[PDB]
Design a protein around this nucleic acid. Structure first.
Length: 105
DNA sequence: CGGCTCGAGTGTTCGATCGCGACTGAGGACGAACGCGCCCCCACCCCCTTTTATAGGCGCCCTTC
C-alpha cells in the first residue's frame, strides 16, 4: 500500500482503483496467495488486475516499465493471483469488465 | 749736479662668476615572501575463485504475426 499511492499517481489512476488494488493486494497477502514473488511485483499485478477491472486499463509493459519489474514476472504474479481475481476485489467496487472477462497471460 | 714725474713688471687679497652637486619627491621596474595545486609516496585494507544448496529475478533466442 505504501507504493499504491505514487504508482497509481504516476498512472493518474483514481483512488477507487488505487484503493481496490490495495484491498486486492491486502487480501492476497493475508491469504499468502503469492508466497514467493516480491510484494511490489505482487502489488503491480494487483494494480494491473485493478486497472484491468476499470476503464483505466494499461499494458503490463507500461506497468512493468513503471515498477521496473520484468513483464514476465508480473505475468507470473498475475497467474498466481488470477485464480482469485473475482473474490480478491473489495466489496465496494464497480466493474468496468467482468472478472470472467479478465484477460489471461 | 739733484729732485721729481712716467711706464713696466710682479705680488696678494678680494670682488665677481658660475658651473656642479647635494637634497627631496615621484615614477618605473624588479624581487621576495606569500601562495596554490599537483604529483609522489606510504599506509591501510579490499578484490578475485570455487563448491554446495535455494529461490527469485531476468536476458536472450526462436517463432509467429
Amino acid at each position: 500500500g505504501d507504493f499504491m499511492s505514487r504508482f497509481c499517481s504516476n498512472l493518474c489512476l483514481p483512488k477507487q482503483v488505487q484503493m481496490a488494488a490495495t484491498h486486492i493486494a491486502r487480501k492476497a497477502v493475508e491469504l499468502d496467495l503469492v508466497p514467493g514473488r516480491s510484494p511490489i511485483s505482487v502489488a503491480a499485478a494487483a494494480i494491473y488486475m485493478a486497472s484491468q477491472a476499470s476503464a483505466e486499463k494499461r499494458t503490463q509493459k507500461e506497468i512493468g516499465d513503471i515498477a521496473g519489474v520484468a513483464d514476465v514476472t508480473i505475468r507470473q504474479s498475475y497467474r498466481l493471483i488470477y485464480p482469485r481475481a473475482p473474490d480478491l476485489f473489495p466489496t465496494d467496487f464497480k466493474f468496468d469488465t467482468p472478472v470472467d472477462k479478465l484477460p489471461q497471460l
